[PDB]
Amino acid sequence: SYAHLFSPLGLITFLRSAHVPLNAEALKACGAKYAFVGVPFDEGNIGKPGSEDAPREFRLITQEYFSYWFEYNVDLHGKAVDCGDVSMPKVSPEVAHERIYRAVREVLKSGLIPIICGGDRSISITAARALSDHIGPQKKMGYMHFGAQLDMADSWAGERNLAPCAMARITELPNLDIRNVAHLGARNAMNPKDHIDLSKERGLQYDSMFDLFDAGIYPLVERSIDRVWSGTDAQYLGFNFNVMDSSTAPGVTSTEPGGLESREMMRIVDMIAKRGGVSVIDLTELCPIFDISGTAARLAACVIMRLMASLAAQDGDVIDDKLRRT
Amino acid sequence: SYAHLFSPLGGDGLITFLRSAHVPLNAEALKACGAKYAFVGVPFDEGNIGKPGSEDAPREFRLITQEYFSYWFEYNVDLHGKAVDCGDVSMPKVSPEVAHERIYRAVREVLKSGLIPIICGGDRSISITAARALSDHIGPQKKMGYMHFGAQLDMADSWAGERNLAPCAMARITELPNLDIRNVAHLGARNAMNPKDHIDLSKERGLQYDSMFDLFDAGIYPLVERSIDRVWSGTDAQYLGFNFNVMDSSTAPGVTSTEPGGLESREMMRIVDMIAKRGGVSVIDLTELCPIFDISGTAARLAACVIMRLMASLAAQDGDVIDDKLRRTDLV
Amino acid sequence: SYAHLFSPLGGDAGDNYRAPGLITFLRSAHVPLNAEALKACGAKYAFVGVPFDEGNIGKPGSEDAPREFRLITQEYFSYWFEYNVDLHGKAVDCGDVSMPKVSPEVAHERIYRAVREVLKSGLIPIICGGDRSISITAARALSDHIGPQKKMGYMHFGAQLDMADSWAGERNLAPCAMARITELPNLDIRNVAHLGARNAMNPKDHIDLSKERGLQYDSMFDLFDAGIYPLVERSIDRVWSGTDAQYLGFNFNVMDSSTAPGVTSTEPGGLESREMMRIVDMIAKRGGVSVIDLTELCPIFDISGTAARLAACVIMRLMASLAAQDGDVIDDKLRR
Amino acid sequence: SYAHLFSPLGGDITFLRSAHVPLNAEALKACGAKYAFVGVPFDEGNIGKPGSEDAPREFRLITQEYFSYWFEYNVDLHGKAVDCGDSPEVAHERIYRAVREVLKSGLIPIICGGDRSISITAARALSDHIGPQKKMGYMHFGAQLDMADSWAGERNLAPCAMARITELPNLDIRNVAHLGARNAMNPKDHIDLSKERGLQYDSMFDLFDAGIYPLVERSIDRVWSGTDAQYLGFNFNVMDSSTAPGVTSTEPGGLESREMMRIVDMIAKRGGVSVIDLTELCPIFDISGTAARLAACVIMRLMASLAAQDGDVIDDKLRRTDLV
Amino acid sequence: FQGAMLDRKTETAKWQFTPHQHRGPAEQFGENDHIYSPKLHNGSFKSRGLATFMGAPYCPPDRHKIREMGAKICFLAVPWDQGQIVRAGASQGAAGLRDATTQYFPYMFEYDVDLLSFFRVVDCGDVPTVPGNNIKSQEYTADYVTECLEGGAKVILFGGDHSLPIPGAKALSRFTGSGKMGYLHVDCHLDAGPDWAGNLITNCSGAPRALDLPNCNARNMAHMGSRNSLNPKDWWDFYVDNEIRVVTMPEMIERGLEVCANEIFERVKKDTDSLYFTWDTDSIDISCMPANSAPECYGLKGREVIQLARIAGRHGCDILDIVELCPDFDPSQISVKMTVNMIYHYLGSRAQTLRQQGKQP
Amino acid sequence: TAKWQFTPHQHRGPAEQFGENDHIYSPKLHNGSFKSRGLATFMGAPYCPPDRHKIREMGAKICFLAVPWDQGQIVRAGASQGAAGLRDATTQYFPYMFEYDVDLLSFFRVVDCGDVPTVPGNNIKSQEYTADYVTECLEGGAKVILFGGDHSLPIPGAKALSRFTGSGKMGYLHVDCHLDAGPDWAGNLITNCSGAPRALDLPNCNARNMAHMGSRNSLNPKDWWDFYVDNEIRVVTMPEMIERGLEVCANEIFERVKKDTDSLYFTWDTDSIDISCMPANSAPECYGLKGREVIQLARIAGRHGCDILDIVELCPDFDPSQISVKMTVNMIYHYLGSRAQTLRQQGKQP
Ligand SMILES: [Ca+2]
Ligand code: NI
Ligand code: NI
Ligand code: NI
Ligand code: NI
């Protein structure tokens, strides 16, 4: 019952959790708070290939961990379920995105928090739209994304829903006020001038990595947290782990030097969790073929699990300190 | 001869730690050889419940140390002749009780000589036997200190019905009769490989471990200095052990169980100088290196630099420096 | 003692501690590079590592071949049931030749003296290289060792002719190797064989020079047309008949890329593993060889050690096949 | 539904994506399948490099890269198999009963992963299942004889397998075949013991000299003629290293892939087999899944070839334009 | 009119290359230096520098520029790998291919041919892609291939995925006009899905799309190399229903490569004016070609790949395409260098045949 | 007569783009080379032969020149593959840097001058080629980015800058985990561990304008340290950089090496960078610069400016990721971005 908290007496799923189908009734009844949804889709990727294999590698990494986090006095066992991968045809991106949209809507309908582990960054477009529709036109949405790239291409090669377009599409959602949008970590030269122009035209208040360094990081992060969470009914949190310094995130689609180090992101996770809630969590652009001994996948897995544990600690959902190995 | 300090001149095999001489594992031979440290390889992994690989760590560690000179310009110290290599303890492969006995005799024999064993292991359970050997070596009238770096507390009273596997190490080590808990330091614990009974047992015994969170919040060095003082003040012997998963995964991938959010290499180097300021240590171990997972030998290279810098910094603190007026033109 | 022929007995103790040792060819004993200590050790072969790659005009990596080659050979038992031969004690390892970096003239002299010393002992040097140019020096050492009144034979397996009279203006780089070796004064071109040449790393001047000198190389296309073994047998006969010493050299890019991926310059459409094994047996029927070399193994390109393992089996089966031909077999009646 | 035979139409983890049926003899007999895949991730008999522990999982995943339809045979493997995938002492007894229960159902167990010592227990379970009044045959492919009477003082490790399997009372030595032995992983006591017992092994050298197939044909006949049940085991280090890197102990100078496929058809001519095993796959050493892909294609081709031999083919007139 | 204002009709292209690449003070200038050991330096045998395919001149894919250079072979990379039903990766093939040509001379002693000057090879660069848009990316490929054909050259097309023969054969069919076109498909996989999840133009439909062309007839089509069960029934039904000859790998092995290949080349060329030859790398055994999206055992061996390339060269084709190479899956060079030799032996055998007939390319 | 011409987003043919500034914007007709590198030069810049007359006709103010020579190397080969990894890594970026608002390509009229040829086995002749080639870039009126190859590169590199500086004075900055100051290595004066003594030998390079930054650990024989003590050349070890702060240290050092000089040679070994960020080295080392510090040092260098920047010892075959090659791209890009931002602030041209 609680034996998994202690030293042992002697499908591939996220955290070795149970599989529940993508069905709202089964999800509400299963008792979990999060629903892991794999999206092995990479046909919005304009860069090097590889992110299609991220959901499997991410899952395999998470099966190595215990569920109890002594730093938070929190047990993750039973807090998540795994709904498998969204079923999507190849060479038909429109249908694939509709499948993603219906999968995210079904999770949101159940009341659980989807954890969307992607192939490419364009899946965030559809996931964010699904949340925007889920809460409806009478609600306010917030959106915070971590990444080295603004992804503010109004169009790219004449197309409108590729990975470098994601933020340009997401900031057009009707119940997402731009003042409730945060983007943290932009740096280096994979940011063409029209992305900056479009950001200025729309009032996108991105926190560049340089901006973050100058402020000591955390005071500026706290201010953007406040913009995303104050006065909004739902919050979307997304990660491209090329926001991290290349040394701790080599296995990503477009790795970037001069970013966040692991202890800094762990602090940011705790700052986010103080708001006591999040509506969707995504992670995209992990690229196992470029990884170094699974370093990027393991960093990603550690951030997601600490985020779950930190939210539970904030909610008071900790375990009884009096439990003993019995 | 001083030619090993300098670039080779023109016209001019054994795999050992720092290209140092081999001396048999014999107390009499070790005392007479003149070294201060005796490196002992212990390729034993049958206390390991995680991914395999630490069995090959001693050889890869030895090979990495041969990429470096013995001279440390930062300290004006020459490590040449300061260590010797005693080879490996013979691992019979199916008698953990017997293997630990051979390890116990090996450490007692090195300690009897007065040299400092540098014990390079397979899995962390090797520390149980080495720490017991030191405790028995100093006897019940002496005080022992103990410091370990690692992401895991290893405070399982029992694990899968066993009492001496790697996750049980600290639970056994803190039972030693001449190791007061106030002289015990554990630095770096973090993340989810620390079940509740490891924390419950640590609280029951008063183990004031310095978690990674504790370290970061204190700026690292002020808290490390306090734990150094607890381990070295008033003790007759000190045991220093490393699991290099104390380091951030980015800088030590080749370890048995890598963990994000750990020490930077520059932080471990300063800590090494802080330890060396106390001017002595009785036993040094490093366990859980896992070369099959390493990239460009990163973890092995980091471990070698930490250990050799410790030797160099101890020599500098001791004033055991070389004649800095020496020049390469003196060889000709 | 013969327990090494049989399944390990296990349950054995008393070793207590293992002295630090050296990674050695075939887990064999280390003997210094000294002719008398070599003559007295009882072995027939002396493995010599040559981690030298400053004659390489292609992708880097062969510097690490001697280490990876040795490590592969340490996985195998010494008894070969196909030949009833025990390789234990038949070889020793002399370590690597000591060579300075960025000083190829000195490096080659160190190689020359090393091969001369092993030959002086009467043992067969097995020279595991970095790059192909080390064969120039090794073959010259054999030519000097036998002297001007004796006849030398030379056979090389490789995808490349290496008949550059000069390359980038230089005369002793890897692609020049055969052009230098075919200049040796006691090596008649009629006693020279080169087998396996194929594909486009063979510029026209290598072909012109070969024709100018009468080098009858057996191209891979020639071998296929002949069913391979009939043509190999004739070149074996040219190299061994009427010669006092024979030099046998391998660039394992002679092998099909599928079975030698980890080489400096891998080549499709070559020999398969079972074919090289028959060729090895054909060679051993001549009952002797003076020098064996292998160069241009490239571990950074290998796939699960495939090329290094192929080379190891070729070399060990050659020793085993020579021993069987010599009658140096094991007593069948030996039991555990 | 037959839709699985064709390219998916627009709109809209087990071996071969087959259904799971519990490891229970009655449930297996009623499910309608002919094979029961059993993963056995056991590596406590392995004396070499580790990795065979993960073989059952990677084998399953590789088979999901293929369709169930074999155009070379007009055979559909869909529904012919189901998946039953799962302290050395009790584990071997658990393996024994797992094989006994599948055999009790009448299905053909396909025993995957783990080190070669598992064949000892599966062969013992089959020998007990048929009883003392029937004759058993055994065929194994591998580079190693595994004829150690004992190894490091043990008697049930991987190098002891053939010494144990050939002691079964209903295994006449003339009904035993071992194909592919070569190179130096064969100590003399393994050869001497083979001579003592009359093990008529076909070394790789013997196979090449005979053109392979004439010799394979004779050993097949020795295993299948006059026997009531036949056990077939694969260590894919029988294959040339170039085509099977991801194995425990790879060896150069072995069978090409095209030669094995032809051998598979030769075995399939006999119209039946009692147990199929594969051991010593080692995925951590694999590149592009080469060993796992070869193993998958051999086992599935054997199933497809057996179905074609039995006449168990599909209606070749079915077309994709029939799906509703 | 933007086209006219931007183009330079009166600036003529020159076919010019430096033997062994490097210019500057140590540039070599000998007319034939590229077929001999390098003289002043190492060329690009160790360090790739700015290498084109074979070191050939770059020529923009422009019919007038190609004809001005007199190029008779265009190398054109088509890295598009998002018409792919298996997995991405073939977008990296062309870079590994070009880099691997630095490991060779453009001279083949097995045929005594200088490939570069015999054909006046040019490297036409890469076809651009529109990510996520298979339809538009294939429209680009056909228009680029059309420029090479209209420039008077025969074409080596180097892929990403096997959607390539769809625009490839479309361009050749259009160029062939009222003449007849043959189509040869060499592959482990039958690649004859009528559609894949409703999509007609993925990398599993090259053969049906070719048969749809107005001047490509079933009697001039053929497939070689198939085996194993990544072959849904409808792919095999296509060949049965349309009477298109399939030579499976078991048949090639039993009858002999030379006999089968010569018969097939006679069939696909009988009464045709042109031939499209598409060659998937997974036809090659996985032991020789691990770097593929769908690598397969029971395939061509290394020496047989070169044999088939030679035989193709004896007969000749107007477009040769080679697809699905994924160099990132291979820690060795075996796969990229296999693809170099497919092209080099094809061209070497083609030149030897033309010269033997007293014909020019 | 040479013309400086490039196609935005590389590809010509029917879908070629022609906008004068298209290279700083999201591609319009296609994906450019972000996925498939095609025929990529450094930064997509025009190729220009290392020829003073062509370079000057193009008006190029920055020449990228690869020096892949890796056989003057005392550790292990591999750096001959660096320049290819670098060029390929620049396809992952635009030539526009939003952190500086600079179009690097048109600001400097960057050209790619190809590779310096090598003579395998002949360190003397290969270094002579490097000096001859570097000289053509300098005489063409350009400042130079030299990409190694092993750290023998500053020997011919600084000789060419020294000759070009004539009667003026040259400074020399060496950033490295290793002191690289062997008087000789096994009798050889010009291996990759002698950049600094060979620079001090130059008639117009004085000790007071020389400096070394980044050293630590024990791949540093005593004669390498004795060189700096005996000639009074300031060394700033990595521990000092950490204790005092990179900016303070770097600014002090750039002031020293530039004081009263007419030109500056800046050689930067990638193993100054911590092994966690830079595994692709012949001799990768812990206790080095962190990723954000590398970019900081490149910006600081760009503020002060140098005549030749060289970056050596990158071995991409040792790295399964792109982190090492992309680190070297950012070293160069942030140098140039900061240099351009400074020039534009000063009202000066490159
Ligand atoms: Ca015009
Ligand atoms: Ni295909
Ligand atoms: Ni295919
Ligand atoms: Ni340096
Ligand atoms: Ni350095």
Residue numbers in the entry:
A (entry chain A): 6 to 15, 27 to 342
B (entry chain D): 6 to 17, 26 to 345
C (entry chain C): 6 to 341
D (entry chain F): 6 to 17, 28 to 101, 108 to 345
E (entry chain E): -3 to 357
F (entry chain B): 8 to 357
Give passages from the manuscript:
The active enzyme is a heteromeric complex of α- and β- subunits in which only the α-subunits contain the conserved His and Asp residues for the coordination of two Ni2+ ions in the active site. Our findings establish the molecular basis for metformin hydrolysis to guanylurea as the primary pathway for metformin biodegradation and provide insight into the recent evolution of ureohydrolase family proteins in response to an anthropogenic compound.
In the obtained structure, both MefHα and MefHβ adopt an almost identical three-layer alpha-beta-alpha fold typical for members of the ureohydrolase family, but diverge notably at the N-terminal loop regions that are distinct to each subunit type. The global structure of MefH is distinct amongst ureohydrolase family proteins since it is a heterohexamer consisting of a dimer of heterotrimers, each with αβ2 stoichiometry. The electron density in the active site is best explained by two Ni2+ ions, which is in agreement with the ICP-OES experiments and the metal dependency of the enzyme. In the crystal structure, the Ni2+ ions coordinate a molecule of urea. In contrast, the corresponding region of the MefHβ subunits do not contain any metal ions or ligands, and four of the six residues that bind Ni2+ in the MefHα subunits are replaced by amino acids that are not prone to coordinate cations.
